[PDB]
From Swiss-Prot, chains B, C, D:
Name this polypeptide is given: Acetate CoA-transferase YdiF
UniProt catalytic activity: an acyl-CoA + acetate = a carboxylate + acetyl-CoA
Active site as annotated: E323
Keywords: Transferase
Assigned protein family: Belongs to the 3-oxoacid CoA-transferase family.
Further comment found in the protein's record: Formation of the covalent enzyme-CoA thioester intermediate proceeds via an unstable anhydride species formed between the carboxylate group of the catalytic glutamate of the enzyme and the carbonyl carbon of the thioester linkage of the substrate.
UniProt xrefs under SMART domains: CoA_trans (SM00882)
Domain of life of the native organism: Bacteria
Length: 487, 512, 512, 512
């Protein structure tokens, strides 16, 4: 049941009224990325409040293409009340740790498709396609020969199955359509046609809306304001109105968590005018970059690469993309060069568009496997880790091993795999592991190729004949005078 | 061997120099729709001329997501020189008929994937997905149990394969990545970052660019002008520059064929302030609409529905979408409400987005199958016909009862046949199916067949005649003009009298 | 002595640092209108703070083209600290009453040019013209044959002079240039090039900047943000950067007083989707309008005309302009049709551009002179009252017949005076003239006086009572309440019954 | 009598129908500048055609704020049919030489107000101000003590009068309001509200519309297209619709003469990515520039300064303004920084806003007076010459020392006069003064005369020769070629060697 469009106008309701249309066991899809990006907060809030006050609705399933929240009690963490959620499928998990706590305690069924694949299966679902065939995730925990993307004991049902085409290895991910969507835009007209002029980006708002709509579901959309019918520029409209069933107006909608007023640099409308360890790793990771290369800097210790490039005066010489869609820009970015929808960005990543990718690691093993989705008994999920480390041309892992000077000190077989060293070699990709103290490469036979100066050399890694001390410049609090390799 | 990017700048070349980068046997993907929409004309012209002069390159494969050209010698027709093209996969075939001539004569390998599916497989190819699973096409010529999308005898290889998931039948369409793209935008910066502010629409420019790029191919993009680096609005940039390898600047780039200067109504930047058998059909088709319904703008005899709605004062009460991406608007539309990329539009169509679907028909058989992709010995191809007739809630076929110069006069509230068509369209068994009556009933759909003299509905026991035009004889003008006998409804009535009167009907649109 | 441009960049300072560049006896010009419109609040606040703390700078002269503030302690009230200002020339005095207090108590030299004339003289001063010649103000207190615009006893120097050209009388207003400007924009680039995309309007920001710049003065500009050199759209730039000497950035800059977030309907970027005595006057005033006429949004009892016209469904048949530049719109208005600079708006008014103008009155005398600039012991000033009442085609004064705790009921299609007002507004002779009955008649203008109980028209032999409210006695409620004897029109009629009925009047707007 | 607005809609007519509304002896004001900038060509064309065909209307007065045309038969040259025009006031005359021919031949009454003053008197007329007071033009041919701005024998009525304020001399220029306007914009809505998004600039379109409107006249506006009411951005609207009486829609409207399609760099929407005597002068002119200074380069031998500054690497370190309103930019110009209305630009100029100005000369006399409005028996007029040379801080005259097929070659770091000019330009006494040496010295301005072979500076005792070109002989090439004796500076020196070498100079811009 959904409210009728009186005189063709989309129903405008309060968040409280809107969430009362969600029935028991509905499948709820939540648009958004970290730190409030494109998040319909009033809808999440009103739902959490309704279950707190009435213990309804019951046993919902959640689909979260990416990780919402503040790595604490925001995002979808408020929906982690027992009996509200029974089932969850997310591209990233640690960003709303109250949800992943439940999965950890076997309280809910829990899957993790790669974030890229997951948004693709929503787009498939919009078109009533049963699933998608991808080699993304072969040889990692999402492979049914391993965990099948299941995150805990209680998760039984198979969603991913192995298939064959051209006598070759592919995964088939089942496409699940949601019943309910919490989406958001900046502005919409009286018929629901929506533009995103002040939003940080687009994510997969249109895909989510289509997937829900074509499932006979209810799309609920939060906006900051509404305008007169047919007055928005048709080339700015990202969501056609007939896809939207309920609009919630939040006049105090903020681009990000924190309630700062609209920033038009962030909107994209104007052009804006310490030698620690993180920086050292950042610094060294930049050595892997070249002119004309398309890269991606990951969530974590790598994030400082752009700043190092700016300092070394080579930032314009290459381009860094963001998995959620923004291309280029400086530190939400400003002065971006383009913004794609999230799904299309992953389309680009899957076919090996990235020349260089920079990823964090929680654990590494003797086979060159990398673990990030699970560490210390806690569920993080992948985010876009697998989308990016599967087919990218050069893969640069970054993190601490546990003149340099190691004050207070603290690389293992992995209980679960997020990146397969073996699959990477067979695809013929160059793999690095950059550390505070030493730098490895992966080979058929992990070759130590470099070690930190001021240091002394669960498994034994080969050793390079060229085994060297890392660039000295890397260790002075001055300008490295770095030069970006040619194209 | 794409040319290097001097200091980050995308190489700018003449169309002539750009096509010299096309080697023998390359797969060429051509962006564009009918009448010049988003067509990189100079790049087509440069390849056609290079072949005319040198007989190189040779044995190219062509992918055309939709039909380019003017139903004559424009579009990719200039590419139909013998030896240039050996293989072609197109969403529509009649728009560049010189190419469909080669297919007709078995000179080339020729496939017709449904247009929507086709552009989705290109998107799949960008992600290096092997193919897509879809039930779009089941029980029609694209089904391997029928023709498997092959258009002639010479076409042998199976690209479409029957598969099963969740106890359901689906088709697996192989995804093929191109090596070369002819794409287009209005403007790009010095690094290739491209906007479409004056383009009629977007189509699947980005998808093609990604598909070719990730296949190690060479993306060639025509633009009207180039601007300083990083001065375009990031939210207007549809194609990131690292996807583009060669830019061709054509200062005389036109929005459509014809050479007309830029029309900023067509651009989207400004708001703009005869009763014959075609209007007749359009009028009766509008009766199928309701308030709040989502329909498609039809190609052919259905194209008059918008104008009739405007005349009847109900145009604002429902929404018509164009297959290639535009949504709403009036007569290139102006005053559109949104423009989606073509692929997303078909995503929406395939999931049953349309409440009402309006399509032409060349032929209808006794099972209520419909044919448009082949007739009169010619290859027309699907366009989006299968993408839209597969899962729309109401499927409304529109056309005259006979073909071949049918002439009628509407006078005195009557239909008068002054010159009958030479060809029967309502035949016994379609040689080849574009739409399955059986599959529509299975999917629970509501099927109408509107003609100028009669209206039918598809039931389980076949076509029911439900309305007959005043002025027309049931036996001589209908039964005699069909190769099968339809069930005659006990509820058979005269077509609404207001339909045949040359004044506004005072039509009231049914409630949502 | 101004700060140097380092590397071609306009210096950016804090408000506190910026105002240290203001010497003793500088002439300071303050941009802005009521309730925070285009007000450089940080600069005013900083100047005020510096004086409070240090008792410098001293003996400034102030130019305020219009009235800033909230009729209380905001606007330039902070600048009324004894010793800071010695001299002020303002188009409006009541909006910052702490300053008007200083004038009333004879503590400063105080002048009132008509607001429109005032901004034209600043524009003259930019060009180094010594003054302007205008008939605006002839026959009023700004006429040197009365008060010469001087507001108190201590003000002596004649700024206004009577002159003659083509055998006609004109005023010559002396053009005075300021030394300092406090201006504002939404955004500027690194060289000071400034746009107004989120501002309520433009006022005379460019004119002020030019007048100060060409006087060797210091232009200080508050903005919300700054952007990269040469990245703003050239057609959006209202102030060339070389006119700006100091930029202050206030990222919390608010469109209006009250610190609300930017409202994009107010910016102009998006299109927005009880019968008391004030409504009665507004209703009767609406009868003076006709299709296609241009009027002015009035301030006071008139300002509900727009809302009455919307209730009656004729709001789109004519157009209301705001003296400060905005044209059209609804209740900062939204959905405006245009925004002119303020000086240009007044050029239009002065040449008789208004078909109809609506104005409040505090007092009317027997010659039909109207007084608003001073009354009840207080200095209010003119605003644009004189610029508008000087030459508009129809001049419609609106107000109640008596004042001070007047209470009326509109019941049973009647006016009932439950409590008569204390103060008679219709007096024998104005102490000071803001509008001249004599001059308007010389100019051939149609002058109305609309009260809740009576309507008059100015003729050669004085006010003619032309209409009287139902429910009111001629002798007791009108004649005994005026200090002169109006002529009774032989066609004396009841005011239209519909005015006093709490339902839509079915008013039909007269034809163009 | 204007045609009625139907339902509030501005009448749309053909140019032919539109000009039919012009009666005999109407005063016609024509918007536009050189080369088709903002020219309502269809309206000029249609008025010219009508007179040719009908010898009506008769005896029109013309006001042309600046010079329209191509120095031949375009612009208002088609209006030169004998008996159509009897009277003309223009800011520049040479641009439509068929009209200036009529004046030379004494067939019409003919005046030249300085271009800036002229546009300012139109603005004054909008406000019903009788005229303006300005010292712009004192001591020149526009000064009544000389020619009072009258260009021939038949012109007798005094429009300009000497006056006095504050013990200083000023000119009083009569403000004349036109009866008809030919204006132009890019786009307007159905009520006349007009945007200039693709126009080269704005000029004084609004001032013209207000002047004519407030004179009971008819405002005719050519546009490229029309749009639905109230859909234009209110901050983009430059002309309120109620000022426009007739619209003529020309879908083929072109930004400039020559019919090129719209150029969006010229619109302002996008950022665009030989050693001879003229380059020599431009180079020596550049020596006069300083960091952060505001200049204007004039049409003529100086116009190469921008390109030189780009070649030398200092183009971004100062700003050049165009008299008609555009600020900054490169070769119409693109990448502009701002565009002002023309009148405001001249306000800025009149108040001494220019640090440096570059102007051409046709003649110089022993007093350092300069002539350009008449020479060789032809009326050229002033353009902005007087507005710019009257008060700018530094005035740099640029030209050759002789005229009349002068041929020079620059070789071996020397100038070589290969064929000496026929005509001496440095003469004993100017027949008529465009710029006065005395007044400039009285105003304390720095005055330079740069030629290809010699540089002079103005002083109390006349011109000082301060620099001489290498390769040139003082006596034979300079003294023998002037009809007066200059002071030879004791500090006389060779002109910078670098000027004369066919490589970048390594010029470094001084900061004062």
């Amino acid at each position: 049941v959904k409210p009728p469009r009186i005189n063709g106008r989309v129903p405008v309701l309060s968040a409280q009224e809107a969430v009362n249309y969600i029935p028991d066991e509905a499948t709820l899809c939540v648009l958004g990325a970290g730190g409030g990006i494109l998040e319909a907060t009033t809808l999440i809030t009103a739902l959490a409040d309704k279950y707190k006050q009435t213990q309804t609705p019951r046993n919902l399933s959640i689909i979260s293409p990416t990780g919402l929240g503040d790595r604490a009690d925001r995002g979808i963490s408020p929906l982690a009340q027992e009996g509200l959620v029974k089932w969850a499928l997310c591209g990233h998990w640690g960003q709303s740790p109250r949800i992943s706590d439940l999965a950890e305690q076997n309280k809910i069924i829990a899957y993790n498709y790669p974030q890229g694949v997951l948004t693709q299966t929503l787009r498939a679902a919009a078109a009533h396609q049963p699933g998608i065939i991808s080699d993304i995730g072969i040889g990692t925990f999402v492979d049914p020969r391993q965990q099948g993307g299941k995150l805990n004991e209680v998760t039984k049902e198979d969603l991913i199955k192995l298939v064959e085409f051209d006598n070759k290895e592919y995964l088939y991910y089942k496409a699940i359509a949601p019943d309910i969507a919490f989406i958001r835009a900046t502005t919409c007209d009286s018929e629901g046609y929506a533009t995103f002029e002040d939003e940080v980006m687009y994510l997969d708002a249109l895909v989510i809306a289509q997937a829900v709509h074509n499932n006979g579901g209810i799309v609920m959309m939060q906006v900051q304001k509404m305008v007169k019918k047919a007055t928005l520029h048709p080339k700015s409209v990202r969501i056609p109105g007939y896809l939207v069933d309920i609009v919630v107006v939040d006049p105090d909608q903020s681009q990000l968590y924190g309630g700062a007023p609209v920033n038009r640099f962030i909107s994209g409308d104007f052009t804006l005018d310490p030698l620690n360890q993180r920086k050292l790793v950042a610094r060294r990771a930049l050595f892997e970059m070249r002119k004309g290369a398309v890269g991606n800097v990951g969530v974590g210790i790598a994030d400082g690469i752009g700043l190092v490039a700016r300092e070394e005066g080579c930032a314009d010489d290459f381009i860094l993309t963001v998995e959620t869609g923004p291309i280029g820009g400086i530190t939400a970015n400003v002065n971006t060069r383009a913004i794609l929808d999230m799904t299309s960005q992953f389309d680009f990543y899957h076919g090996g568009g990235l020349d260089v990718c920079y990823l964090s690691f929680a654990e590494v093993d003797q086979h060159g496997n990398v673990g990030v989705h699970k560490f210390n008994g806690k569920i993080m999920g992948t985010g876009g880790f697998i989308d990016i480390s599967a087919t990218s041309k050069k893969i640069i892992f970054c993190g601490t091993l546990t003149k340099l000077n190691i004050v207070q000190e603290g690389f293992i077989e992995l209980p679960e795999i997020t990146f397969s060293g073996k699959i990477a070699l067979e695809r013929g990709l160059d793999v690095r592991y950059i550390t505070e103290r030493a730098v490895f490469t992966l080979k058929e036979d992990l070759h130590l190729i470099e070690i930190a100066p001021g240091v002394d050399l669960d498994f034994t890694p080969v050793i390079s004949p060229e085994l060297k001390l890392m660039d000295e410049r890397l260790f002075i609090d001055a300008a490295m005078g770095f030069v970006l390799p040619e194209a």
